[PDB]
Structures are given as C-alpha cells and as structure tokens.
C-alpha cells in the first residue's frame, strides 16, 4: 500500500512569462523564482538546502 500524488502539477504562462513568450518567442518556467536569484539575491551560492 504505497502513497503518492492525487493530481498533476499545473503550468500557466500567465503574467510576465507571457511577455517573452509572445514577443521574443522563448519562455520560462517559474519566472519569479528565476527572478529572485537575480534581482533579490544575486550572489547566492549553489547550495542544496
């Protein structure tokens, strides 16, 4: 008797994802989490925790 996910995981191109998708024709995944390592914490080392 295992355990696991009951549903899928979503992916919408709402917000600023849409901008580079429509204009530049290339898109992202998790644009905000992508952004927070550049505009907020740009010096952050690659650490697992």
């Amino acid at each position: 008797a295992m355990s696991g996910p009951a549903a899928y995981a979503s992916y919408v191109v709402r917000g600023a994802n849409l901008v580079t998708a429509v204009s530049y024709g290339r898109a992202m995944r998790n644009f905000e989490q992508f952004m927070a390592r550049i505009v907020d914490h740009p010096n952050a080392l690659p650490s697992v925790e």
């Binding site: 919408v12 191109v13 849409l18 998708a21």
Partner: protein, 49 residues
C-alpha cells in the same frame, strides 16, 4: 419679342429636355486568414490563448 417690321413673327415655343441618371459600381477587396476564421470561436483556455 413682338416687333413691328415686315418679318414673319413667330408664335409660342416649347421644349422637351430629357435627362437620365448614370450608374456607377465600385468594387473593393478583403482577404481574411485561415486561422482567424478558425480561432474566432474558441474560448476557456489558458491566459496565453
């Protein structure tokens, strides 16, 4: 004008002047896309669509 020399004086006169309209057609052009006529009716999808 009645004038009193030895002409033949002339009687009353009358004219028939016929006028008609003139027809003009004018022809223009619109082309529309394949996909535009297709996706005019979709709905409900992602905020990209």
């Amino acid at each position: 004008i009645a004038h009193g020399d030895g002409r033949r004086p002339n009687k009353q006169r009358q004219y028939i002047v016929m006028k008609a309209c003139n027809k003009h057609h004018i022809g223009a052009e619109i082309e529309l896309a394949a996909a535009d006529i297709e996706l005019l009716f979709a709905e409900k999808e992602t905020p990209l669509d």
